[PDB]
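$ ./design --mode recover --in tokens.txt
reading tokens...
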């Protein structure tokens, strides 16, 4: 029997930062202080204009999201009028920030999450990580050659950076609404080092005494994605239009609007610690590959369907497990693992299985990643 997926409106984005829809402002061969870098990145864009709301947050105070972005711009203009750029910027505690910083309906699967996953498996033009017995050695280098440019690896480094920055600011600046650039770094195909700005978050108060204590934040992320194409994906966001980008195409130059995706969010101490640990995804998926290799001859696997895609696909699954971590995901994977073994055991053809299905399917509510894996599971069943 196939798994029963819930009915309801399309599921919506719930990651801590944009994935496929992200947009970088970058500077090449920059130099180390986040705020400094962020400003220089901002200055590379000249299409800025008066911001306006173009897709409202249905459940939020929309003017507050717009005032917040205007405030970020204003305080950035201030710290450029200062003699020396400060090491960090604590935002004025305005009414819009105080509100923004806070001071289960079933959903159907929509195609955007499979699309996200597909994007995560792809190669990018940039290298996102450098290579840090001898049989175990050759494997680490070949594997790394295959995933260092992978988009999922960008997500890892992006996630490590923002969780490190947020966790540190949470400890060092507990009562400040600190402004925190979202940054990553990479190397181009020609070897040039590049610094990337995705946007900003602003932290709320953060006396994180326990691992489960939550710090609130508001995230502000650049994008060229028009949210009106997939409104359901963006139910948690206010989207602003903030500039115009002149884009060079083989058809000519095209003007496209730049958007800012804004939402309020929160994360706990322990999720941030896991966030800092996302490079484990590289190791964890390398081990799965070695398990396949040690079932037979290392040079043969990586020199001779294709090994590159298998690496990147395992990495993306691992990365997406981290990005979309949840009790439901843990419930689904632990339980569906049991059904799989039982079904696979029928290569030979607590009582019944009615109980097992209930355990699996009650994990299937509204989480897009869990729902997608369910859809994958059904394909495995229906074959």
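writing sequence...
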């Amino acid at each position: 029997r196939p798994l029963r997926l819930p009915n309801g409106p399309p599921c919506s984005q719930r990651s801590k930062f944009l994935l496929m829809d992200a947009l970088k402002l970058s500077i090449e061969d920059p130099e180390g202080i986040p705020l400094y870098d962020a400003i220089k990145c901002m200055k590379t864009f000249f299409g800025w204009k008066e911001p306006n709301i173009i897709k409202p947050h249905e459940k939020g105070i929309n003017p507050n999201y717009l005032l917040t972005w205007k405030q970020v711009l204003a305080e950035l203009q201030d710290i450029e009028n200062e003699e020396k750029i400060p090491r960090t910027k604590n935002m004025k505690k305005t009414s819009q920030l105080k509100w923004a910083l806070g001071e289960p309906e079933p959903r159907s699967l929509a195609c955007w999450i499979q699309n996200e996953f597909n994007k995560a498996c792809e190669l990018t033009d940039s290298s996102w990580v450098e290579l840090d017995e001898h049989i175990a050695s050759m494997r680490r280098n070949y594997f790394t050659a295959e995933v260092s440019h992978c988009r999922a690896t960008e997500y890892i480094m992006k996630g490590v950076y923002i969780n490190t920055a947020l966790l540190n600011a949470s400890c060092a600046a507990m009562d400040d609404f600190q402004l925190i650039p979202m940054i990553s770094k990479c190397r181009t195909k020609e070897g040039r080092r590049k610094t990337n700005l995705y946007g900003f978050i602003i932290k709320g108060r953060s006396h994180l005494r326990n691992d489960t204590d939550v710090v609130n934040f508001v995230s502000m992320e650049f994008s060229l994605t028009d949210p009106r194409l997939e409104p359901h994906k963006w139910e948690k966001y206010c989207v602003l239009e903030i500039g115009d980008m002149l884009l060079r195409t083989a058809v000519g130059q095209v003007s496209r609007p730049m958007f800012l995706y804004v939402r309020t969010n929160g994360t706990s101490k322990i999720k941030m610690k896991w966030g800092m640990e996302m490079r484990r995804c590289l190791l964890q998926s390398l081990q799965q590959i070695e398990s396949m290799i040690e079932a037979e001859l290392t040079k043969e696997f990586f020199e001779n369907g294709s090994i590159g895609k298998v690496c990147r696909t395992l990495l993306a699954k691992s990365v997406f497990n981290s990005l979309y971590a949840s009790p439901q995901l843990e419930g689904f994977s632990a339980e569906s693992r049991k059904l799989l073994l039982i079904v696979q055991a029928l290569r030979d053809n607590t009582f019944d299985l009615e109980g097992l299905y209930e355990a699996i399917e009650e994990c299937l509510i509204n989480d897009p990643w869990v729902l997608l894996n369910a859809s994958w599971f059904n394909s495995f069943l229906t074959h």
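exit 0
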